[PDB]
Amino acid sequence: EAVDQNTAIVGSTTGSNYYVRILSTIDRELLKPNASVALHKHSNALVDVLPPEADSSIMMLTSDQKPDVMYADIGGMDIQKQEVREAVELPLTHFELYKQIGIDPPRGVLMYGPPGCGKTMLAKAVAHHTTAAFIRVVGSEFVQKYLGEGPRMVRDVFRLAKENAPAIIFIDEIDAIATKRFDAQTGADREVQRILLELLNQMDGFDQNVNVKVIMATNRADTLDPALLRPGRLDRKIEFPLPDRRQKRLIFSTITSKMNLSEEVDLEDYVARPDKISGADINSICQESGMLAVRENRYIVLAKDFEKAYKTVIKKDEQEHEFYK
Amino acid sequence: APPALWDLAADKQTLQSEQPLQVARCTKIINADSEDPKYIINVKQFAKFVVDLSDQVAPTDIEEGMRVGVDRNKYQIHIPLPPKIDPTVTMMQVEEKPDVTYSDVGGCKEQIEKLREVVETPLLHPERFVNLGIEPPKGVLLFGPPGTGKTLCARAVANRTDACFIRVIGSELVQKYVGEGARMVRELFEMARTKKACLIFFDEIDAIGGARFDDGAGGDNEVQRTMLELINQLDGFDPRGNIKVLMATNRPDTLDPALMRPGRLDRKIEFSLPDLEGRTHIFKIHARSMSVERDIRFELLARLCPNSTGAEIRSVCTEAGMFAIRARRKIATEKDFLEAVNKVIKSYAKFSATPRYMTYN
Amino acid sequence: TSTRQTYFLPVIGLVDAEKLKPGDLVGVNKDSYLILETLPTEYDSRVKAMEVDERPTEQYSDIGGLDKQIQELVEAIVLPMNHKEKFENLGIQPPKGVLMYGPPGTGKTLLARACAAQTKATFLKLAGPQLVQMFIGDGAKLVRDAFALAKEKAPSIIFIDELDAIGTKRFDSEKAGDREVQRTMLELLNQLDGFQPNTQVKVIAATNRVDILDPALLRSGRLDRKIEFPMPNEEARARIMQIHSRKMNVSPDVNYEELARCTDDFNGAQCKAVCVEAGMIALRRGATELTHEDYMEGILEVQAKKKANLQYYA
Amino acid sequence: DPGNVSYSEIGGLSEQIRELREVIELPLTNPELFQRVGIIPPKGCLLYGPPGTGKTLLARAVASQLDCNFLKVVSSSIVDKYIGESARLIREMFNYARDHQPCIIFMDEIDAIGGRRFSEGTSADREIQRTLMELLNQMDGFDTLHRVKMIMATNRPDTLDPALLRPGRLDRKIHIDLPNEQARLDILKIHAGPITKHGEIDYEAIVKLSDGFNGADLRNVCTEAGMFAIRADHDFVVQEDFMKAVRKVADSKKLESKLDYKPV
Amino acid sequence: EEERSKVDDLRGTPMSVGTLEEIIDDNHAIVSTSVGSEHYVSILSFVDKDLLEPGCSVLLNHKVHAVIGVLMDDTDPLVTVMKVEKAPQETYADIGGLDNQIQEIKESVELPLTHPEYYEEMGIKPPKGVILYGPPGTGKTLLAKAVANQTSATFLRVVGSELIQKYLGDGPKLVRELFRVAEEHAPSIVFIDEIDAIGTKRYDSNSGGEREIQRTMLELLNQLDGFDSRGDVKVIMATNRIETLDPALIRPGRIDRKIEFPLPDEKTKKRIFQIHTSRMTLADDVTLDDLIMAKDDLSGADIKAICTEAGLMALRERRMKVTNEDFKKSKENVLYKKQEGTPEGLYL
Amino acid sequence: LREELQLLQEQGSYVGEVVRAMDKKKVLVKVHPEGKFVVDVDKNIDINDVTPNCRVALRNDSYTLHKILPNKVDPLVSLMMVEKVPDSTYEMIGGLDKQIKEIKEVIELPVKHPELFEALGIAQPKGVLLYGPPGTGKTLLARAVAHHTDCTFIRVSGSELVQKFIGEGARMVRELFVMAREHAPSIIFMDEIDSIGSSRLEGGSGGDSEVQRTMLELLNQLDGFEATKNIKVIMATNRIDILDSALLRPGRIDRKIEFPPPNEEARLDILKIHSRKMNLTRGINLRKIAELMPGASGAEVKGVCTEAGMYALRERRVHVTQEDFEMAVAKVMQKD
């Protein structure tokens, strides 16, 4: 922060905050409340900040390789796409339509419900829809040996979101750091959960309205804190439904297209008997049905290959009870 | 300050002696030795240092795992420091000064006698049992009705012959830290063997002795760290130990620590608890309390309070003086407090009659 | 550099690249960053050497009545040493692990170490729970160091205890309190599997109960010789009590038959306590001489239970 | 690890030898077979036990049979130390695993480092998941994926959590069965090896008395019967004293066979 | 005066704040400061070395790593909670109606301190405190003597509750709470209330459940058992219903006096409400004859609640008024509240 | 600047943190990665501006404090307090007018009235409860009555970062009982952790039944000592176990308010309330449009406007014809 004229305080990369006389040239415009400023070795003199910015390490994008999934599957409904069309491309870049109606669009996207997978399919599918910079980091990616670099990395990640538009940041399963432990050895583990509360303080800096898109995905939300799922920051909870009966037939069709034809092999019998023993055990066991085709030894997958794949997992033990059906 | 004047004025010789040994930072552990001159050493800075030793210290005094001084310039070995250990955990472990002498016994003879000869007698006359050997037992055990618990351990404190002994309880070793109990029980005997004459005591093994295994999820398996490792560390041969330790708990539970001790430990006694003619012994030490009338008969009120040990009849002479000041009187005749004693047994038995049968059953 | 910094220097200078594959422990001077010599051996402190044991004060002759089941023990340790020349002719593979288990006291730990005294075998003391520390990855890294010495050193021997507890995988995990060791044991079992040279330096294991046993323990390099120890018979119970007392004075006028038949389920360690309690009463008795009736007195003393008597039971 | 032959000599299961043969070794010698038809090889596998033996050996022999390429992973390196920095070492170990092509990844005894989040425990269970994140990240690339073959092993597959229980990360699940009659003479010939015996013999009495045993356990029975020869001061032994040492030791192993039931 | 301008060059001006590790008989005092650094400190200055003890905040001079002296320690967020006192704002003029109970335990709380002469001649002494229990305020019944014990010596109130207090348990920092308050004065009164152990809805977070809640209560014994504590720290425990204390736990204490207050009668309830209203009434005019006669029966708890809403509903008129149709209608809510659960029974 | 840089040249200059102040003029200094330090005077700014926990600059050579810097302690808390609730003044609340007249005399009395306590003859109220199927307005009314009362408002748990800043071995709610006193006198609330998981306070008691002790101990001090009065709480729950909250509090002394389900008087004004932030026309009749939905929840009022407002966002026009107004009602009737 800028405490007074001619001098200001600056935290060192090692984490120790330094109080340094500012250079007499530029005292104001490039100062900023929070920024990375170069310092001299011995004197740690304040001279020049970043543009901003040089950003940080790791990387972004990588989702543009193509192809993934076409959105035309839901194209027949138009009842589902109408809510999606209003929740995707209009929240991306639109301006005069918001201030008119006055509704402030939230940045919150929370994805729970796996299994099944869902998720990253609709991620690379948005890449087909629109083009934007995708920040992809694991929840554990910023864990380091020192606690001074941590607050800077998540700051450099969120400060390029407001700097560049449009921007989408994806972090996978932050429920790990959501674990609350006060112990000193876990102090850094609790320091990264306050980093999670730090970037949480930084996500209201996007308000309002420019700019960010925050998509959140986790396998288990029970360990998450109440204030993380509270509205005003994440106002939209998108629950991925359990595969149940609906995701069955859709997920057998998508794998058999990647499987070899199957112009001979007739899917009629594999949607019945293997469907009985499904766990589920839904998405990628269908890939195991294809991974028993590499077991062959056969050019066009035999009927015995499929049936053998699903029958191993998972077993059922019947029937002395449910026979009422 | 006048005591702080000459105290602070001594810094002139300090700074002269502060230049030597100033480089001792930091404490460092060694690793192995390929040859005599050069040893590899590791310091808490995380940096390992191979170095030779100064001509002031002989090479034979450097053993693997020894923390020694250093000269941060030359990195050479300076002076060895005996303690390797331990962060905290000592202050609750260390017990000093006496209390509760032998005169506080409540009349139990054979009980307190055979547990006195397991500890006080061997150390008071080492040549006796060595020439009489045979061999002293490897440990003891205490449990039963509550009276008299934790006092018999306090008896050896004031009866201690030379040096104070260590007290340890189970709940202070809980984790957080795992492995201290191992590290602890190894070092206290290493500290012992130098001066000997230091007992090791553990209390309340029932809570930490949960046995054996359950389906899931554990559960008892994290509790197996406390019971199995402590017994295993007790199961050593060295020697083992010189003071033959001690044990005290509430219930005999559980089965696994109870079946492990006969292979090592010995002298399992069951309280006892007052005898019908022994309840007056706790009244004898209480006969010196305040002013006792000569008409009082301790044999009369003893039978009226069964299974009262020394704790429940300590309230007798308490309720004696209690209602004495309530009634503004001075002494308490037998009939005075015993009228309240027949109440203190029954009215306190309304909610619980204080059975121990239902604990293990 | 172990300081967590990393540097860049030309190849030493002095000792050339002939030794060795990328190492550690080498000496280097201050900030000049030149390594004069490549220094062994490995690390660290108690991890390198767990315990230094010369030889026990007792020998295998101290067990009475167990001569049938000591031969199986003595064989597996002794046969790979002197009889190795006969194995290459007949294609014989020596046993590695041995499971020694019985209700305590079974005199297992005394018998194990005592067999290393006459065979010159260097003994190393180790316990299962000793491999668990606050810091994760300690006892696990120890076997990496321990079995590396098993390749470096020749048996000798290694003995451990309480393998059954540390071998508890529960049912629903994770995890138990034995974590570091249950990974260490199955690693101790892993290097026996994947690495053939590990057949050097046979390892003895001991358990106090069979309730929890890892089925993975069955292998040639893993536990092979297994003999259940019941309560010794009347002949053996009378023996062991005399052979535990060979180090001390033994009282005359003893039939040895009466004290033998009166012992049912009584432990061998309790038989030592019989001569203790009979020797403790010798103090107050005033005479160090003991009688045959004093044995059965201390025999019935410790067991069954203590100290009460049967009344109200009709 | 040897084989080729020594892998196919394990005697069972017959079709499981025919599994990782074309799954692991084949992609290097003939990668064109998979890409022309369009079928992808599996990126992972899981071998559990012990209904019998062969959980490790099945993947272990095909591990070095692909080429001199292999990278072995021991579960002792994942735990590291307090504030363990092995998060980058799991990245480092897999970084140098990609130095070998085509790469193979092993994981053994995951029932320790595979800590389950069902009942939420100390943060040690969290850093277990973080080490799992270092596993998945580099194997989720953006880098060599279909070319590298990852293998994990466990005592029981209840520790995998719904993430690893799912295919993808852990794809193939394979158990072990017992041999059959007249196939007992097959697995016998490869267990002969160094140990030899009298000229006129029938090995069927030896192996039949021990059923449902580890390959080393039967190898112990051959040595235990051979270590009875030195007590008889003869090179060979008659099959009468054989069956004695065979039956006794075998029945002693069956009492220790408890806890063979494993969750599916 | 001159010592301030003298030693300042010997210690400062700059210096550091470290922690103490161990002391050697050679006068070298090993200290540990952040992070992971030791040293041999030999100083004769200002010590006071005996009063220190390890774990201290003792300073370390910059040149070179020496301890000149100490300042103080606050310490931790844990001490700032209670801060006063609590002074006698709960008055004996707020309670009344209990006689046979009020006479007996008044001696036990006053048995230490005054009348030391026949207390020291005893020499056995009951320095165990007391124990309370019972619903709803039966434990709060004699709490009025605990606040009456705030007029002298010192008092402490520790809420037992159920969940929030967890720790290892090991009870490490709650013994600190008891120890730091006794260091100011050292007489003491320590009061524990509302043990929910039997009434738990579930276990909190990773504790246990089941036996681990029992073993921290067994540690609550071993603390209180206890070895080894002599002075007071007067122990007072309270709850709604006690099945908790084992037959072993009651033996050290309280083996002398534990209290039970029966449900109040017409004499106690009239003496409860008239004394509670001695400070403040509603519209004056209050007669207690028809109050206890109308509602039969229930504890004097809710008699303040119906009077709480009495002037509260009249506050719609901003001070004073009574509506006959509304007052009996507003009384119907509490009248039916007790008249829903009227029978038991025949509790008898 | 060249000469001044030479003063800052050697080590630079640092920034410390003072945990405690002494009258001896020695001030303790603490750097975040480093250990605690202390230094002699060091006197630059007036000493009254120096307080514990405050941020201070640090010189390299003498390691003194060059200036005094504004710190943030209350901003930490208060930022978490503004996350849970907006402002929501009296103009942001409506339909509770019958209940706001019930709650005010409890809220308004200790801030302004209290000299008439002895006249009215009642002790300072221990708190208020609001129970009913949600529903909204119970949280909005918290800072509403408090806004015109001039008293500031503090919010509630999880807290969630008070397990470190406040120690673990610390007593928690008792330490939060300090934060309410450290701040200017304010009001508290209960939010929320009231879930349908099965039915119980089992998971809610961590942030509710334990905070029930917070209202007792705060008003126990306010009675006894410290200063000055003005500490209050408001409960938010639904049904069932509230009777247990009535078992914990035997009516002494709790203001009676039953949090209503959405009501005609509630939906009438609370609609216009949320329509003040957006610019629309007056052609909408708020009376009858509220009576067509005798049910659902109070949060559905915002669900009407906001969720169905995306349909007017579809046609790219700020206002839509009446045909969509019936469609806005048709969408909320399908979820019923």
Side-chain angles (χ1 to χ4, degrees), chain C residues 136 138 169 171 174-175 190, chain D residues 80-81 108 112 156 158:
Chain C
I136 50 184
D138 294 342
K169 52 185 175 182
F171 296 96
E174 282 84 351
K175 201 148 48 175
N190 197 342
Chain D
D80 190 350
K81 204 68 172 181
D108 180 67
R156 300 157 300 196
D158 51 350

Side-chain angles (χ1 to χ4, degrees), chain A residues 217-277:
Chain A
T218 177
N219 59 342
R220 290 189 62 177
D222 51 344
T223 56
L224 294 179
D225 295 342
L228 303 175
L229 286 71
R230 164 194 44 76
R233 294 184 175 278
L234 308 180
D235 308 6
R236 302 292 184 269
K237 298 175 180 176
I238 298 174
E239 295 299 323
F240 179 78
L242 197 65
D244 294 337
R245 185 57 63 188
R246 286 294 177 265
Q247 276 74 348
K248 296 292 188 177
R249 305 167 187 173
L250 295 177
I251 220 151
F252 286 103
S253 64
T254 182
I255 184 58
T256 190
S257 298
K258 298 304 294 181
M259 292 175 179
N260 55 337
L261 282 70
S262 178
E263 97 284 8
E264 180 273 334
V265 206
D266 187 14
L267 300 178
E268 296 175 353
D269 62 338
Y270 315 121
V271 80
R273 189 190 185 277
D275 178 72
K276 303 296 290 185
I277 203 169

